[PDB]
Amino acid sequence: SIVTKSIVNADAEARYLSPGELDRIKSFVSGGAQRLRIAQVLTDNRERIVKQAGDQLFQKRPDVVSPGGNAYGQEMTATCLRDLDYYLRLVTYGIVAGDVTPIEEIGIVGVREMYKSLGTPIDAVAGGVAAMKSVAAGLLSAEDAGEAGAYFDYVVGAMQ
Amino acid sequence: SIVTKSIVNADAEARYLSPGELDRIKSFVSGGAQRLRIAQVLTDNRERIVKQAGDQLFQKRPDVVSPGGNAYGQEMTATCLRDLDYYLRLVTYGIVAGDVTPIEEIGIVGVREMYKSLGTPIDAVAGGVAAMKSVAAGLLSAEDAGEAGAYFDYVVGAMQ
Amino acid sequence: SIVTKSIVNADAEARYLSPGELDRIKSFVSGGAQRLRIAQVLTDNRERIVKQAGDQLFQKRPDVVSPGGNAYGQEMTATCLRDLDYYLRLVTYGIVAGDVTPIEEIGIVGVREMYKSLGTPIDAVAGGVAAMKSVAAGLLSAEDAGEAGAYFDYVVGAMQ
């Protein structure tokens, strides 16, 4: 969370938080209700966001659901959408925390090593997450889509 | 500034800025107008802030303006207020930058060596800067005095 | 070559070549005619080795020549077989040199970075090289296939 990130940064310099850092935490707490509402839109629409993102991905990358592809067949395709649902869940955690740390610690450290071992094309996983961003944005105000978008972009960039 | 600090930290790790670093830049620039207003109050009141701080200082540190004192006489007292005016100018730079780096680079690295050579009691320089903080605080909201105060406190602590 | 590798290893330890290194060079030069003959079999049969390896790869990984796949279409498929011909050429250089250094310096340093940028699944490139090993082995004695096989295995392992 923004609170832990601020504490870790201050502790690394053996110092108290600055007035500016404390003001950032005040803004975070005052905006908490709005962040919970944004996270709740993604939670409430998770089935449609994941389903439509999967459809967009498989239209761009039909090879991954073709013979020899990592997601070929009903069971592997379902597992692929299960992973997209994991990443959407992590994006909701990042939004409420005001920081990508929960996403990083749960879903990013070691992600290239995991998908390399599985033979999953991680560029296509990133495309699935980018598709979820686009579907989620359709359910949000321009302002709320801007906020949520940063968390999806973090995941996409961390997989590239 | 926080922009340069973020870039230097990212470059040291051969990476793009983190989402946290980018959020810190967003928070910094959203406060820009308020920082410029604080800097302008100190700039516009610089003669009175330095004059009144000097008067307050000589009462706490009679030694420096007593015969044998570093600031004894009209010319040396004027040079003392010249130095306080330098530090007020640097505090305005720190306020607009959102960090102490301009103050550090111009007025703090080597400050103990310079004043030791000149025979200036650096505890009394710190007292003069603390007096400027108190005069400036009278011209500012509690919130704005908190922000400006961090920069005065940095200078006082670096001299103590 | 085995000669350069032996010299570089000895120079790193500020020493003359070891008796082991010199024996390897004696064995290498006495076996030179046999290594040139093995390399000439791969050179003479490069069309069939590359064509049959490509067919084996595309049977195991039809996704790479399906829509969305990196080798989709006649031009991209031809470029894929061009890369297999590059690696067969490098394998002939390693065989004549008695060492993988020419393979490493021309085709392995940076290979993951190159194929990642191109979007080529490097596991499938490794599969193509493994298929060339199997086709080439059919054109060689058991002993000669053992020697050539080490160079193909080096490339396959370096792409994992």
Added chain:
Amino acid sequence: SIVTKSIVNADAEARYLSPGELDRIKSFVSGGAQRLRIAQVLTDNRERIVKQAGDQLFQKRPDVVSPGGNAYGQEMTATCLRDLDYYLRLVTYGIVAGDVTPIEEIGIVGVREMYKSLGTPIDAVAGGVAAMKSVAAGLLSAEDAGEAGAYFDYVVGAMQ
């Protein structure tokens, strides 16, 4: 002492003491009676050395015994003289040891942090020690004042 300093230097070079180090120990112990007499003069005159040094300091630094000053009032002034008596005691230890390490280990490591916390201007503490040097010097031969002076100078320089 000079004996420990010689042993530490020899141990750092995994060697027996040098002929020069052994000669310095012989010269040190032959001069021991004279060092003990210097320590005895400072010990016997400790009340007058500290009282006179305090008066000289408070004339040069009237701020420390003025309202708001660290030593303001009878009790705080007595504590200030208690500290000068501590430093005179440590100077006698250095003189008998022929080495500053006893002074360093008791009264110098962390001294700036201690006096900063207390709000005591350490430049004024250094001035009090310099005043003790000047008062003590009048009780000693030119040779003995030279020897004692090095230990007072060590303390003054270690507080600067």
Added chain:
Amino acid sequence: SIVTKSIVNADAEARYLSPGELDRIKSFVSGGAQRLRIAQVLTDNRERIVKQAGDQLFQKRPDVVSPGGNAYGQEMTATCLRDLDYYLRLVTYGIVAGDVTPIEEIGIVGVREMYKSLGTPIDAVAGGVAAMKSVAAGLLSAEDAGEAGAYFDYVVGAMQ
């Protein structure tokens, strides 16, 4: 042996053995029968190699078996031949290992310090080992004497 050296080097780089390291192990083990035969000639003739080397040394260096000499008298001369027998045994270990490491670890690290403490002239020990080389060479083919000679030369050089 080259097997352990290759494993230690590979482990230091968190990698499998290189093709070059594996080829060096193949060359090493293919020579095993020849190395065992050379070691067996030295083992079978150990009494004569040590006795004749001792006689050659004492003819070249009569001082070591003359009054005042380290090997003077029946008991000390027997201890001298005991040491030459130790070094012949270590040479057989080096020959079977295909490198000097067993000789280094058992008989060379600290050898100068041991013989200096004992007052044994290490140049004469080296002469005894050089004499064993010459006697052993008479029992070997030119090729086998070349191989064995490197191990005796290592010991002679390590004592100079």
Added chain:
Amino acid sequence: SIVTKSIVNADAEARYLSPGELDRIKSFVSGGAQRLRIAQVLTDNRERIVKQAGDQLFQKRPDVVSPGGNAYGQEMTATCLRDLDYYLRLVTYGIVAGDVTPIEEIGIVGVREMYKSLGTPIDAVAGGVAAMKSVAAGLLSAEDAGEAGAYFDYVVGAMQ
């Protein structure tokens, strides 16, 4: 010299010479005439010191003047005495300098590598220098022999 050693030590600690270093220079120059007389007595007696030391060495180390020995024959024996005369000259330089560094810089750095290349047993060179010490001591007061002896001892120890 003692002056350079004091300056090098002071420069390494970014400081002026210590009172102890300055006192040692004063004591050194006051004894300078006596040091110069020691160097003159060794210079005046150099032929006998070297000749007698050579005789003592060749009696203790008959191997070096026996067939196969480094000093075997008239010409090589003369060169051996030439080297002892070099070391006596260097000892006179150390005595006048009050420091071993002139000896170190001319005759010790790389000495083992030089004599190893030449096949000269350096322990016998050390014995020759130790023998010169004993002859020189007979020409000097107990105090002057103690001083000269430290410089002979330095050379002997540096060749062990």
Added chain:
Amino acid sequence: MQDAITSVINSSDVQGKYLDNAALEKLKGYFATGELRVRAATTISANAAAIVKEAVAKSLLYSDITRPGGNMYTTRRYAACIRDLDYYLRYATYAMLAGDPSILDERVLNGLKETYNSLGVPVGATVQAIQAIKEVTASLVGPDAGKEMGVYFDYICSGLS
């Protein structure tokens, strides 16, 4: 370390769940009074040296502890002791901002009792000094914020005992 927010996220993550009503109520509980934590931390930061100075004056000075033979005698020991009190105040402030004492276990207390015992640092006097820091801090941040800071000061003291 964990804060009040990450503790909730972690408890949802181990279940593989999106934040449910109970989790959201815990997050709302942090947001409801988080500004009061920021206000207390602002005051403590501005006064950190003064808090330690007053606590030392009230609990340690002019006693056997600072005189020859005492564990705060010598400038090195005096400086080490005030450095430790500075640490306790700084980390207690972090823990209060976080609403979670985990940073104290991770960054303050791990091996601390053993270190003090091995060096002969008196735990009783340290606990008296921490109690003084708690009282001085409460005078500046007000009774309610002083009670919350007291939770973390007491956590550190218990960790020494």
Added chain:
Amino acid sequence: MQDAITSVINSSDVQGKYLDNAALEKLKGYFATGELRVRAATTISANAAAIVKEAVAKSLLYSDITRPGGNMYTTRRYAACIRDLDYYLRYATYAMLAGDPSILDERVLNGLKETYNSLGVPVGATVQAIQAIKEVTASLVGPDAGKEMGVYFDYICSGLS
């Protein structure tokens, strides 16, 4: 390096001046754009590999440069070239966040022409690739951010020539 803010502070400091109206106008200009610079940097970071891939496909591939004898032939040289383009994009992004090209002189261009000349790296082909990165970047970040990124791409190219 300097950013737009520090450049103004430094120019005022060398004159011994408080910030004047002209200086304050430059600071206001930076603050008014900061969020747009962050938005562009976020997009570029998320797409950095894809930007270089598309630029390389447009400007370098299927030419003499990637064939035997060309400077991008061998996997090592191909990888070195895309690493250079990754550097140009990452540093141009820093310069755009800073609103100042000084980081490019300090950390990218110092000795670069001399390095390329000593190694035989073709400057013309590199400049063509940077032009392609500028076009691809502008397609993703929009015209205004694309123009601003273009200033820093052109600054790097000029520095090679």
Added chain:
Amino acid sequence: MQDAITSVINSSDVQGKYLDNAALEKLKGYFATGELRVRAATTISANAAAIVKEAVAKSLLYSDITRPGGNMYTTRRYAACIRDLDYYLRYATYAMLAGDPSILDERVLNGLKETYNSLGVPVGATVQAIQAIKEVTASLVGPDAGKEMGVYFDYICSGLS
């Protein structure tokens, strides 16, 4: 570490003995197998990632261990687990080349059980995964080399128990 040759030399040296008939038989035994060990190591190196992938698919995936609450949940823990299996295969290959398990005691097992117990890494699941690596390796290197590799896989598993 020791290899099969150095183990024999060391056992003869501690007795002060020249190599006797029993020692020479052990050396002959190693030399007669060296090329077969190199052939197996070449195959394993070329297939190392694929061996671990197949073992993981057979023994760990689609279970409580990879789901939330399981010890392979989170990308960091998944990656740590396959890193451990990569270590077991690489070190078992070294031990097979050496014909001696001493490298496993020195570089793999020293404190490993204690590390797994302190972190909550499940030993039973790890042993099942190593058994799967043994089976997949044997399929690639053939029965004799598979049996020899099995000695070292079993040595690692025993060291965890």
Added chain:
Amino acid sequence: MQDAITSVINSSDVQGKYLDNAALEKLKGYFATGELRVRAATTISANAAAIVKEAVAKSLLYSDITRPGGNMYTTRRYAACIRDLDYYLRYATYAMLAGDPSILDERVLNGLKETYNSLGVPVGATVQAIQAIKEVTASLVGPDAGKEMGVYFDYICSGLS
């Protein structure tokens, strides 16, 4: 470490006392022995290799300890053992110059018994060798200096037991 001078300073400092008549008389007592300590140290330095040689010949040579299976077998172990004896003589000489054994606790004995036990160095044989060094040293420096050196040799031996 402390020497006889700093022992007196430390005992006065813990009381907050200037050196009194009794303390100055203890310093005079040390200064009156300084030349005798230097004379002994000069003789030991000149004979250091010879002392260890004779002690080893008397206590260790021509025994199971130097033969295969013994802890002084191999040139590396022989050299390590005589290096340890060289250390004991050099540090005992320092302690005798200092008139205080504290250097032995700080620089010699801290963890030494544990190191020897972990490596299998026989402590009984080491103590016999130190006894031999004590006897040889006493023969060279005379009875009074031999007794004083014996205090420090016995201190090292007791520290191993």
Added chain:
Amino acid sequence: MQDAITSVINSSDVQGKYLDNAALEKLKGYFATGELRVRAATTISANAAAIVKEAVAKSLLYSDITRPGGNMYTTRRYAACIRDLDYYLRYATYAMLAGDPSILDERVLNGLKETYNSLGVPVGATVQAIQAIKEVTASLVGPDAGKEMGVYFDYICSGLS
């Protein structure tokens, strides 16, 4: 570095000669000045900060050099300048003790002109400050020692020009 003693030793060594009458007379000439050099060095050491302070006041202060735009503006540059003057006084004092300027070439002047020119440190002003140090030093150590110190101050200045 060389001193007046090692200059004589080096000139004798290059000839392969024992010290002759001329060499001994040169050494006597140095020994006859040693106490005067020590007396001057003692005075300079006791007044080192005061010498630099007075020289700076006479030659640099209240000028364009200390104002914004000058090379001594900013505390870092002021401190660097007085550090350089501290170096010149300390090294000139060493050279005077040595009776030889070689330490100045080896430890002060090697690359110094080039460093100053690359940084924009004004050499004219530096030489004026060294002239002021020479005058202030001469006032304290007296005419003969002032002249000898002047040789080394002038040597440093010539090395900058």
Added chain:
Amino acid sequence: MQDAITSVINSSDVQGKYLDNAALEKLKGYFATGELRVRAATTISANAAAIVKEAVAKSLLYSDITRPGGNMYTTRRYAACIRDLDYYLRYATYAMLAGDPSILDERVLNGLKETYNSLGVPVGATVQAIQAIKEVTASLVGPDAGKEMGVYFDYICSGLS
């Protein structure tokens, strides 16, 4: 560095070609006489110290160069010079094995003339010593191998001139 084999591979690779008849004839030219290079290298390795010793005795000893005033006077300079001759022999042997002098440009000659000129190492005498190494080497490896070694010795000498 390149050897005779890698030079051929590189010339084929820059053309994108499998080895053609002309390339195979160049490889056969290396293989035809490569055993003679190995035989010479074996002899030189076994005699490396003896070759340098005899060359020094023939070309440098008992001359102005080793007497006071000469560049091999002082043990440090004697040792540096024989170290340089050891380097020339070791690298000439590598170049002979490679059949290519490129290792000499890369690892011996780059900046060597400039280093010798700055230190005052006489190139004439170095070339005379290398000529002596060439003659002594030729006496041991025979005239034909001595001529091939001479190519590389002459390459080093030319590189100094």
